[PDB]
Amino acid sequence: SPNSQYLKTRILDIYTPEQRAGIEKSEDWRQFSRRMDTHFPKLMNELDSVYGNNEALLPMLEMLLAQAWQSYSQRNSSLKDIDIARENNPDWILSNKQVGGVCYVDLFAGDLKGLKDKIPYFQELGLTYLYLMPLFKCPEGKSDGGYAVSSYRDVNPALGTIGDLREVIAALHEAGISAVVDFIFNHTSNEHEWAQRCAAGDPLFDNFYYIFPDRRMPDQYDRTLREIFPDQHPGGFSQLEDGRWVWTTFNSFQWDLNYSNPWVFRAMAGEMLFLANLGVDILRMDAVAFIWKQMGTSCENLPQAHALIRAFNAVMRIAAPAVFFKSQAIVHPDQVVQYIGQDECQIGYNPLQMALLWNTLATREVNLLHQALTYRHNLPEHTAWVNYVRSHDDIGWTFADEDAAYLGISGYDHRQFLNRFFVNRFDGSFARGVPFQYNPSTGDCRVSGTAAALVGLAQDDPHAVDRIKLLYSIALSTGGLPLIYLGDEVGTLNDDDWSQDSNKSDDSRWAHRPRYNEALYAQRNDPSTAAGQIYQDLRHMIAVRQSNPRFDGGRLVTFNTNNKHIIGYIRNNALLAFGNFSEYPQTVTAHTLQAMPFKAHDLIGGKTVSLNQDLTLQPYQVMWLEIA
Ligand SMILES: OC[C@H]1O[C@@](CO)(O[C@H]2O[C@H](CO)[C@@H](O)[C@H](O)[C@H]2O)[C@@H](O)[C@@H]1O
């Protein structure tokens, strides 16, 4: 394999002797050159582990590097300063100061200009991280909420122009807020130019997707493929009008990109560099699990998928160090953590914690949550979880059957209960969610609905408000970067129009994708309304998290509370958090608290609590005790 020094000499071959000498002494080249030596080895090794001796590897690689240099050379000076800061501070993602928020630009603020006018609110809330849902061109009507990309560079006209996007990003950086967007690298819409030209037989896009002449191979692949949207189609393939079949893990209008073609990696790396130079701080790598296929396997979490992501990572370390990756893997817990690494995805969603927060609200027993916090929370250095309560997606019950089995819980039976409970098909349930993708051949099913709808705020359950604070308190204090689903901080309910909208009716996820609720937001400072109670109480926790060093980092050690209804953990051996998941008062005995200081200040209620006597928590009460 070629080395960094050799490849760099060829990068400079585009310049004449005179120009070359100039580049050689330029600061930008010195930076690029240095990073090349440090990170190229990783890029080469990863690409080689996937493509091996492919004739196109070297040519593609040199093309990619020439492009990377030009990209970095063009990269704005201010962004280069962030590159340097990020290089020296890899743990910025682990700081307790970070608090994130996510929203659809159209649903939350109409368009990009309106979104820009919302930044003051974001500052008011304390956000330092803002993730914006799919903003680029996509099919009219059905685009899976923008996840069917027809272009990675042209902004959705209803949202604005690429120029408005740069302004938003600039304004966000000005307000001390990092910009986060998706990089839907596993698939494009069937309307993307690459898809059209590939299907048309254009030789320049040959093998950019997986297209078959008939069902022979698809049938074989389907023997082991998991169905993501069984409502849409069986297996992982959709048929074209001409009779051929294309790989479509998701909607039929979302075509899976063929990373087995090195030219596909190169093309996507080019798109990534474009996003990077827009000033994006973090890219949410959509469906990282599916970027590699292999007959006879589930075609999820394969070795090459990880390798390819680690390759993309090295490209950033070389051409835009400030850009981090956020893994979005909604799979088995054993697989989820594999995407998280300083050299792969520095951060990643923590679906296990999210899914278990809801499990605990339903069962009132913290067993599974405690187990997860005890054995699957701590991560390798310079990485962090993105902890959340809800998102634009349905809730999948991705806890491990193996973990459950150890607690004497049947995974399959338990999900049946959870699914019944959260869609209000279980006696006494307080949840008002809606089913999503119930698969009759597997029994699998997911849940849609906003945080407030699932906790019972729609029917004014007196415990609804406190339930929301409890869930969010855990995502805000366990360690990691918390991501608030904007709208939750004021108890926004489900959208009551989606079910009859012909473009949304077959996707219950729109139930939990409501528009900015003027009314609720106008009540955020009124302590007598649910909106104000949720907001002020959530804002208080944010204020505490960001100013109190005891919440720094992402490591935690659980504490055995000896009360099956109360979760307990300790941060930096100085902050003891208790969360009561029962709708009834629950107690932590003095006996259990004997080793703790006799007194401790509770950051939540602001009162000093005695630990040398039975500690009783009110229904869904949360305590953040400073024991050091
Ligand atoms: O139920 C959705 C299903 O898709 C996943 C795959 O990671 O979610 C991401 O990708 C989908 C297809 O591109 C998007 O529709 C979805 O919005 C996005 O978060 C998982 O959440 C799940 O397996």
Swiss-Prot record:
Name of the top EC class for this enzyme: transferase
Location(s) in or outside the cell: Secreted
> Principal localization?
secreted
Q: Which organism is it from?
A: Neisseria polysaccharea
CC per GO annotation: extracellular region
Name of the gene this protein is made from: ams
Q: Where is the active site?
A: 286, 328
Family per similarity comment:
Belongs to the glycosyl hydrolase 13 family.
| Note in the entry | Like the recombinant protein expressed in E.coli, the amylosucrase may be secreted in N.polysaccharea without cleavage of a signal sequence.
Q: Which UniProt keywords apply?
A: Glycosyltransferase, Secreted, Transferase
Query: Which Pfam families does the annotation name?
Result: Alpha-amylase, Amylosucrase_C-like
Where is the site labelled Transition state stabilizer?
444
This enzyme catalyses:
[(1->4)-alpha-D-glucosyl](n) + sucrose = [(1->4)-alpha-D-glucosyl](n+1) + D-fructose
Q: Which residues form the signal peptide?
A: none
* UniProt xrefs under SUPFAM superfamilies: (Trans)glycosidases, Glycosyl hydrolase domain
Q: Which GO terms describe its biological process?
A: carbohydrate metabolic process
Residues annotated for substrate binding in this entry:
144, 187, 254, 284, 392-393, 509
Q: Which GO terms describe its molecular function?
A: amylosucrase activity
**UniProt name for this protein:** Amylosucrase
PANTHER family (alphabetical): ALPHA AMYLASE CATALYTIC REGION, ALPHA-AMYLASE FAMILY MEMBER
How is this protein's activity controlled?
Answer: Amylosucrase favors hydrolysis at low sucrose concentrations, and polymerization at high sucrose concentrations. Competitively inhibited by fructose.
